[PDB]
Amino acid sequence: GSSGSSGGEKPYKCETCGARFVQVAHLRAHVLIHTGSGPSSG
């Protein structure tokens, strides 16, 4: 089920793509996808 459709209260926003999150720990952990590289997909 859990897919997405979530965009309400979020102070932190990813400028790299334009994402958003409630806590920095989440955003700062997502921005690593672009600047960084983990798995062989994404």
Ligand SMILES: [Zn+2]
């Ligand atoms: Zn992003």
